[PDB]
Write a protein that holds these residues in place. Structure first.
Motif, mmCIF file in Angstrom:
data_model
loop_
_atom_site.group_PDB
_atom_site.id
_atom_site.type_symbol
_atom_site.label_atom_id
_atom_site.label_comp_id
_atom_site.label_asym_id
_atom_site.label_seq_id
_atom_site.Cartn_x
_atom_site.Cartn_y
_atom_site.Cartn_z
ATOM 1 N N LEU A 1 0.829 -1.199 0.000
ATOM 2 C CA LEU A 1 0.000 0.000 0.000
ATOM 3 C C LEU A 1 0.866 1.252 0.000
ATOM 4 N N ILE A 2 2.059 1.157 -0.588
ATOM 5 C CA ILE A 2 2.986 2.280 -0.587
ATOM 6 C C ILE A 2 2.384 3.437 -1.365
ATOM 7 N N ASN A 3 2.358 4.610 -0.742
ATOM 8 C CA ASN A 3 1.790 5.787 -1.379
ATOM 9 C C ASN A 3 2.322 7.030 -0.689
ATOM 10 N N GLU A 4 2.684 8.026 -1.494
ATOM 11 C CA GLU A 4 3.048 9.335 -0.974
ATOM 12 C C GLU A 4 2.437 10.456 -1.802
ATOM 13 N N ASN A 5 1.493 10.148 -2.692
ATOM 14 C CA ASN A 5 0.962 11.132 -3.626
ATOM 15 C C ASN A 5 0.121 12.205 -2.955
#
Ligand SMILES: CCCCCCCCCCCCCCCCCC(=O)O[C@@H](COC(=O)CCCCCCCCCCCCCCC)COP(=O)(O)OC[C@H](O)CO
Ligand SMILES: CCCCCCCCCCC[C@H](O)CC(=O)SCCNC(=O)CCNC(=O)[C@H](O)C(C)(C)COP(=O)(O)O
Lengths: 12, 81, 71, 459, 122, 86, 128, 172, 127, 55, 55
Positions: free
Chosen positions: K1-5
């Protein structure tokens, strides 16, 4: 979804 | 979406560095029972990760590109003076 | 966690990215590489050492005023 | 003077002759009204005390305590109308009669101009409190508790009686002004020490110092809520008022004889606060905390330094308001759980969120967190003590370090943590308890803006 | 530098102690030595709000730096020559410091060997 | 985090047992008791539950780890531990 | 075999290295069989009053009130003056008090000595 | 109850591998070392002398108690982990919700109506489920803390309320 | 070696009631039924203004929410502080004590006009 | 220290929240391409902490 | 679930990034020269600021 959250009465 | 779980025909152990341990167990006399688990960590886009020093100099190619134009601008400006 | 997230998760796969997060990445990574040696070009002396450190031994005794052994 | 006394005693016929159910109302009305009139007395002139007649006078020390006692009077009525609702009207009226009769004596002694007049109602406060602790106390060992509290003070007060009348036969009158102006250097003759001991031990007992303090844990815990507040917020402080008044003719004997008490008090506060760190009973823990703060005042008064008196008067009031509040905290929790063990009802903050706050500034105020009046008291005393000797800061600061651990210890054990599964009678807090709690904390921070009101005559 | 080893690892008598020097008289060894002629009097150095550790001989090349900084504002890239001039002055001050250090250092070993020379002959 | 629901659990669950080369894919059943029919030794049973542990990210206590015995029962104990009802 | 782990009052020996249960007997195992029984005998009725719909109150633990009693009141009636109790009382009693007295006395006996002969400085000390 | 030998070995096997994971960190090392760690386990499986098997597990954990990683790896939700009862402060018992003011209760009518059904159900079920308890309680008190299910139809298993109505592990 | 059938059934119902209870912990589309809310003339004016949705409305929406935030949180507080400072705090001596503005050789002052003397010529140090 | 040290935390906090609130350094790896900005942020922060010239 | 947007994470990190990149340049050049600067370092120990970290 959305489900009921329990919480002590803060009305008083 | 419904989180389509990929059909399990792609995350085997060949190529993924785990098979080196696999034959080493075979050299010892055992078969690794979970190579297909770690396969995803060594396959797909997750493979061929950059080296340590490769991380720090990230953006050097563009950084040097900004350098050469910068010195060209100031050398010309100094020359015009 | 409602349906419609732009970072829809994956199982045992490389997560999807967006052009926006990439372009914001290397630019600062490149501009950090811009800044470090740009100042090196114009402020080399301070990190290099600029002014030299003289070596005391080569200096004769006339400036040090060390009189000869006789007196 | 009179403008406070007759309104207080004329309040007594009102409660007796009021309607069956209006007793709490009309008593609360004019008790707050009396507080307003007492606040009008808070004004003081430069150096001469506000003198009214041969019988009554007030100074910059008496006035802050006077307004505190009248301010207290509504609070017991507010705090008591929950465990006395199921009682016959006469007993409720009698209970109210005890409080205002007690409170009436407090105005009398603080405004008393003659030491004997100060003395007569000095023990007269005991009789109403003895009734309150014994009759309406909710425990078994209250009987032995009342005996311990009664006999300890009498054992110290009676030497004062013999000492005080001796002053009268030797130095004429015992009017506070006439003593101060005609003060003479007390000699070092071996009789003068017993002279000194008698004039001091009476105020020592009802200002619990290490050794002479075992009545307080038994006094506070078994006493009902109203009894606990009055006893901890004013009663431990008649001894304080006496010392500032009576040490006028104990010098320079106080300089040399102070040592055994100073060591007993300074070491005692470390010991007593250590007891707080491991107390099983919430009310007892608050009670022992009063000993530590009070023992700090013992060093404060007995150093006899301008700064020391000032910080004493600062801790004089601030501790009383704080200790009354913490006893309210314990009481407001007690009947819900019907037990006194601290670990009985853990994780109360998740159930009662506002009481989590009320317990929080209450613990912070007892922490001497600046700029609360408690900090002004302790910090002023430390500087005065440090000038007296450099070593004491090791003892002084250590108390603050211990005071930190046990103060938040009740906070974590009760408020924070996991709620107790088995209990299911914890109802949402009545707004009476909430209102009372703000009735305590709000004037405390209101006092922070004007320390000069409660700094005292040394200011 | 290396004198630390020469002092502790070697003998300590042949390293001038930083808490001791200067010991030999300045005239002794320096015939007709000149004094450090100061430039900015105590007045001007004072009202410039100059801090005590900077109230040195090179402070004259510090004060006008502030003047250059005052007119440079908001530009902070000015005063480069003046700052370099100031640092170069402290270099001249500094280069004197170990000169005095070895002046005492060379003298005291000279005194040692001279003492042995003028003692072993008896 | 989207709501992890029991259909996703069993999909991820049988994903790993099918992954386990000792259990080849053909005869995986939702209630396939391990050593009764698949022949999986109980010493490897204390090994497949840590595979589950990293699969869903949480610790399985041993009191029930030895009791976690069937893939459906694997899913069943997963659901209530994370209040998965949907 | 690297040297063993010696325990302490503050770092006890873990049960993984405890020799008792690794050398069980046909009696000790029997001992740890009614342990659970009495534990159930304490747990069962607890849940009964815990899960009782009519129950509106607090399930008082007899062990809890026992602990408070033993730590609050049941001390002096069980107290007996003995040399251990006597010496510890004296050591933790008069001991620290007199110790601090000597420390404060000598410190004050040096302070007034200095000022009496003018060997101390309080030029700016006024608000004493 | 009886911590018989095989469970102890499984305790040894499970926890040691977790520690071994905390050591190797890299998956290939963890997989490689696990198999040899596995290999040296099952090879000694033929011991009619159970005492000898115990003797083999004297030095076993002693080496572990030496070989234990001083900082083992724990998922945060587990005891010792970073997210241990992190969301406990949010979960509140259901019975406190009965205190709610009627206006607050009116804000959630149908759910409160559902509560009434649960309150109704637990009422008669209590007598039924408690009645099942005494009629089948073993003599001399309960011997095992395990609780017998609802034998007949319709009735709920005894002491079901707190387990079933336990607050969810992620309350917010 | 896996639960016994009775306790397996026990966990079965325990699961079943828990699912129903967790299902019963949900909400409804109408829930929560909040009461009528008092509204003032200004806000629904902004609502109907913003109903168009195009950026022309929102650009001045942020500036207005920034406008009244500037006035009632920056402009007003600095007003009363200046009044307090200019006529109460500064009305008492030695309350706002500055530092003497550092003056340099060759720099004139405006209060009395004269320029203090320039520095005397340096001994000509060059690198 | 106010700038780069404050950085390393929510830079780390970015990986923590994104990778399901896991704080054990032994569970990441390969995040360079997964979180390019967070990775970019950390390398500048670490280089600043080490004291790389002119930054 | 990697996310930095998420812009909140991106904007916050970038805000200090431009701060950390330059940082000391502005402060050192802006503040008056108010500590004594040592000038003649024997180059061997002036590199120590970089030698030890590189080592
Ligand atoms: C529970 C025990 C008491 C608790 C602690 C209380 C304080 C300890 C000391 C108690 C002193 C009580 C008596 C003091 C009365 C006033 C003293 C006074 O004014 O000073 C006189 C001090 O003179 C005394 O003798 C006072 C009494 C001294 C102590 C002896 C008796 C008191 C102690 C025993 C009785 C109380 C103890 C309890 C017994 C059950 C001055 O008179 P003088 O002797 O100087 O007269 C002139 C000339 O020299 C001849 O008179
Ligand atoms: C990194 C490494 C650190 C160091 C790590 C530890 C390594 C050293 C210790 C290794 C084990 C030790 O040698 C012997 C022992 O404790 S036990 C031997 C097997 N015999 C038994 O235990 C009894 C009979 N057998 C069974 O009970 C079952 O067969 C069993 C449960 C084992 C398998 O599951 P199933 O089949 O029931």
């Amino acid at each position: 979804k959305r489900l009921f959250i329990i919480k002590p009465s803060g009305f008083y | 979406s419904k989180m389509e779980l990929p059909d399990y025909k792609q995350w085997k152990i060949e190529g993924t560095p785990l098979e080196t341990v696999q034959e080493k167990l075979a050299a010892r006399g055992l078969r690794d029972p979970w190579g297909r688990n770690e396969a995803w960590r060594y396959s797909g886009g997750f493979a061929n990760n950059v080296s340590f020093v490769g991380a720090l100099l990230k953006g050097f190619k563009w950084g040097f590109a900004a350098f050469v134009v910068a010195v060209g601008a100031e050398y010309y400006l100094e020359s015009q003076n | 966690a409602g349906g419609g997230v732009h970072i829809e998760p994956r199982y045992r796969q490389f997560p999807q990215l967006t052009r926006s997060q990439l372009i914001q990445a290397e630019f600062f990574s490149a501009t950090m590489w811009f800044w470090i040696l740009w100042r090196f070009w114009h402020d080399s002396d301070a990190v290099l050492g600029h002014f030299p450190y003289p070596d005391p031994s080569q200096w004769t005794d006339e400036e040090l005023g060390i009189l000869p052994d006789d007196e | 003077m009179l403008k406070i006394i007759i309104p207080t005693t004329m309040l007594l016929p009102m409660t007796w002759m009021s309607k069956h159910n209006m007793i709490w109302i009309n008593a609360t009305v004019h008790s707050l009204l009396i507080s307003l009139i007492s606040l009008s007395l808070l004004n003081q002139l430069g150096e001469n005390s506000l003198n009214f007649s041969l019988t009554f006078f007030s100074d910059s020390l008496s006035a802050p305590l006077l307004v505190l006692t009248t301010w207290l009077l509504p609070l017991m009525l507010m705090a008591s109308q929950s465990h006395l609702s199921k009682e016959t009207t006469t007993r409720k009226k009698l209970y109210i009669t005890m409080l205002i009769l007690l409170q009436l004596f407090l105005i009398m002694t603080f405004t008393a101009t003659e030491l004997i007049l100060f003395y007569i109602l000095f023990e007269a406060t005991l009789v109403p409190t003895l009734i309150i602790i014994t009759r309406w106390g909710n425990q078994t060992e209250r009987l032995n508790a009342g005996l311990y509290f009664l006999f300890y003070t009498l054992a110290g007060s009676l030497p004062l009686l013999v000492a005080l009348v001796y002053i009268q036969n030797t130095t004429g009158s015992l009017n506070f002004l006439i003593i101060h102006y005609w003060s003479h250097p007390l000699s070092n003759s071996w009789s003068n020490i017993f002279m000194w001991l008698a004039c001091i031990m009476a105020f020592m007992v009802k200002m619990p110092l290490y050794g002479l303090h075992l009545w307080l844990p038994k006094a506070h815990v078994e006493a009902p809520i109203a009894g606990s507040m009055v006893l901890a917020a004013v009663l431990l402080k008649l001894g304080g008022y006496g010392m500032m008044r009576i040490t006028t003719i104990l010098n320079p004997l106080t300089n040399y004889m102070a040592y055994p008490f100073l060591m007993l008090s300074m070491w005692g506060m470390i010991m007593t606060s250590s007891i707080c760190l491991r107390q099983t009973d919430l009310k007892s823990l608050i009670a022992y905390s009063s000993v530590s703060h009070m023992a700090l005042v013992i060093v404060a008064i007995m150093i006899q330094t301008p700064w020391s008196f000032m910080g004493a008067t600062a801790l004089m009031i601030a501790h009383g308001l704080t200790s009354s509040m913490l006893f309210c905290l314990a009481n407001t929790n007690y009947e819900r759980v019907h037990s006194r063990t601290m670990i009985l009802a853990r994780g109360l903050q998740t159930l009662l969120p506002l009481m989590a706050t009320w317990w929080l500034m209450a613990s912070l105020t007892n922490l001497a967190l600046p700029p609360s009046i408690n900090l002004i008291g302790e910090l002023f005393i430390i500087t005065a003590s440090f000038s007296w000797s450099n070593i004491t800061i090791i003892l002084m600061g250590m108390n603050m370090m211990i005071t930190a651990l046990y103060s938040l210890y009740m906070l974590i054990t009760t408020q924070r943590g996991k709620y107790t599964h088995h209990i299911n009678n914890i109802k949402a807090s009545f707004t009476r308890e909430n209102a009372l709690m703000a009735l305590h904390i709000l004037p405390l921070l209101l006092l922070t803006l004007n320390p000069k009101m409660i700094l005292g005559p040394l200011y | 530098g290396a004198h630390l080893a020469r002092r502790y690892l070697g003998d300590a008598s042949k390293e001038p102690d930083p808490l001791r020097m200067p010991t030999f008289p300045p005239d002794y060894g320096f015939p007709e030595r000149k004094e450090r002629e100061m430039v900015a009097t105590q007045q001007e150095m004072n009202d410039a709000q100059l801090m005590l550790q900077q109230r040195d001989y090179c402070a004259h090349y510090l004060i006008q730096l502030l003047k250059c900084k005052r007119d440079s504002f908001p530009n902070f890239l000015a005063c480069k020559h003046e700052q370099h001039d100031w640092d170069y002055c402290e270099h001249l001050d500094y280069v004197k410091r170990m000169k005095e250090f070895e002046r005492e250092r060379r003298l005291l070993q000279r005194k040692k060997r001279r003492e042995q020379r003028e003692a072993e002959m008896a | 985090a989207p709501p992890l629901t029991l259909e996703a659990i069993k999909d991820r669950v049988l994903y790993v047992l099918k992954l386990y080369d000792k259990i080849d894919p053909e005869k995986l059943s939702v209630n396939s008791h391990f050593m009764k029919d698949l022949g999986l030794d109980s010493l490897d049973q204390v090994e497949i539950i840590m595979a589950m542990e990293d699969e869903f990210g949480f610790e399985i206590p041993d009191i029930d780890a030895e009791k976690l015995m069937c893939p459906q029962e694997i899913v069943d104990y997963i659901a209530d531990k994370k209040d998965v009802y949907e | 075999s690297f040297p063993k782990y010696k325990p302490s009052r503050l770092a006890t020996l873990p049960a993984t290295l405890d020799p008792a249960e690794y050398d069980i007997s046909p009696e000790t195992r029997k001992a740890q069989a009614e342990r659970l029984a009495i534990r159930s005998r304490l747990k069962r009725e607890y849940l009964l009053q815990y899960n009782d719909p009519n129950r509106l109150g607090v399930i008082e633990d007899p062990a809890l009130i026992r602990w408070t009693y033993a730590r609050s009141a049941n001390i002096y009636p069980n107290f007996r003056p003995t040399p251990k109790t006597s010496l510890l009382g004296a050591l933790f009693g008069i001991g620290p008090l007199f110790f601090w007295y000597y420390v404060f006395k000598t410190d004050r006996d040096k302070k007034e000595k200095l000022i009496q002969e003018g060997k101390l400085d309080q030029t700016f000390n006024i608000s004493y | 109850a009886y911590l018989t030998h095989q469970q102890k070995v499984l305790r040894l096997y499970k926890r040691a591998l977790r520690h071994l994971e905390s050591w190797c960190v890299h998956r290939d090392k963890y997989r490689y070392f696990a198999c040899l760690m596995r290999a040296r386990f099952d090879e000694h499986k033929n011991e009619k002398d159970m005492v000898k098997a115990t003797q083999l597990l004297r030095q076993a954990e002693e080496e572990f108690w030496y070989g234990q990683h001083p900082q083992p790896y724990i998922f945060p939700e587990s005891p010792g982990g970073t997210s241990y009862e992190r969301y406990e402060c949010y979960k509140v018992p259901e019975w406190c919700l009965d205190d709610w003011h009627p206006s607050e209760k009116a804000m959630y009518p149908d759910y409160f109506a559902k509560r009434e059904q649960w309150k109704r159900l637990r009422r008669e079920s209590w007598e039924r489920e408690v009645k099942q308890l005494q009629e089948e309680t073993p003599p001399g008190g309960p011997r095992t803390e395990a609780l017998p299910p609802a034998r007949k139809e319709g009735d709920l298993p005894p002491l079901w309320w707190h387990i079933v109505t336990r607050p969810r592990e992620r309350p917010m | 070696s896996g639960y016994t059938p009775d306790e397996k059934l026990r966990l079965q119902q325990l699961r079943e009631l828990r699912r129903r209870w967790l299902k019963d912990q949900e909400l409804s589309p109408r829930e929560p039924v909040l009461p009528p809310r008092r509204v003032w003339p200004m806000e629904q004016f902004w609502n109907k203004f913003l109903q168009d949705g195009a950026p022309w409305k929102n650009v001045i929406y942020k500036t207005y929410r920034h406008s009244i935030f500037a006035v009632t949180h920056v402009l007003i507080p600095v007003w009363i502080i200046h009044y307090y400072l200019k006529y109460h705090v500064t009305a008492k001596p030695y309350t706002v004590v500055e530092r003497k503005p550092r003056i340099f050789p060759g720099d004139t002052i405006l209060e009395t006009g004269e320029v203090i003397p320039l520095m005397k010529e340096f001994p000509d140090q060059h690198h | 220290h106010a700038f780069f040290k404050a950085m390393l935390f929510m830079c780390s906090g970015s990986i923590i929240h994104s990778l399901n609130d896991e704080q054990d350094i032994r569970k990441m790896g390969g995040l360079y391409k997964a979180m390019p900005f967070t990775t970019t942020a950390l390398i500048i922060g670490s280089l600043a902490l080490t004291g790389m010239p002119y930054l | 679930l990697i996310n930095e947007n998420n812009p909140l994470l991106i904007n916050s990190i970038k805000r200090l990034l431009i701060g950390s990149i330059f940082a000391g340049f502005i402060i050192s050049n802006n503040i008056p020269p108010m500590t004594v600067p040592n000038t003649t370092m024997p180059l061997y120990m002036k590199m120590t600021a970089l030698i030890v970290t590189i080592m």
